[PDB]
Design a protein around this ligand. Structure first.
Ligand code: HEC
Length: 121
């Protein structure tokens, strides 16, 4: 029951490292490039952005769970704190994350907005 409208505002916390750009190159939310493009993230295979240099931990999660694609629930869990999520999914205490940013509240709203921007999910 996240609110995508509120989620768009919440996205201001993410924009410094992530943009939302359509495959055609259309900017939905102009943002940085430290992190991968979030357009179509819902339903997308974990760490699958082309040309994006992902960290070791998330690549390990993809490798270990090949069929894993991001679901809204997983996304909410991950943005809460990537660290523990990665430890959980890799069973590796030392799992490294390139994303240290944590979102302790309003996770569902931001996820709802990501979903709005994952039209073909
Ligand atoms: C704002 C609340 C957000 C949200 C919703 C997301 N991020 Fe980030 N992010 C950053 C980096 C360097 C990465 C790559 C991580 C790595 O390799 O370990 C990510 C990755 C993500 C994902 C995974 C994307 C995938 O393709 O699988 C998701 C869903 C995600 N982020 C959401 C870096 C940053 C930041 C840099 C300082 C900031 C701020 C954010 N992220 C913010 C958010």
């Amino acid at each position: 029951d996240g609110d995508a409208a509120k989620g768009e505002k919440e996205f201001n916390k993410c924009k410094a490292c992530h943009m939302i750009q359509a495959p055609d190159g259309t900017d939905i939310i102009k943002g940085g490039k430290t992190g991968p493009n979030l357009y179509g993230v819902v339903g997308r295979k974990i760490a699958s952005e082309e040309g994006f240099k992902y960290g070791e931990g998330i690549l390990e999660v993809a490798e270990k769970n090949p069929d894993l694609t991001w679901t809204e629930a997983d996304l909410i869990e991950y943005v809460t704190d990537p660290k523990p999520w990665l430890v959980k999914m890799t069973d590796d205490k030392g799992a490294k994350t390139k994303m240290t940013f944590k979102m302790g509240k309003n996770q569902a709203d931001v996820v709802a907005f990501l979903a709005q921007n994952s039209p073909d999910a």
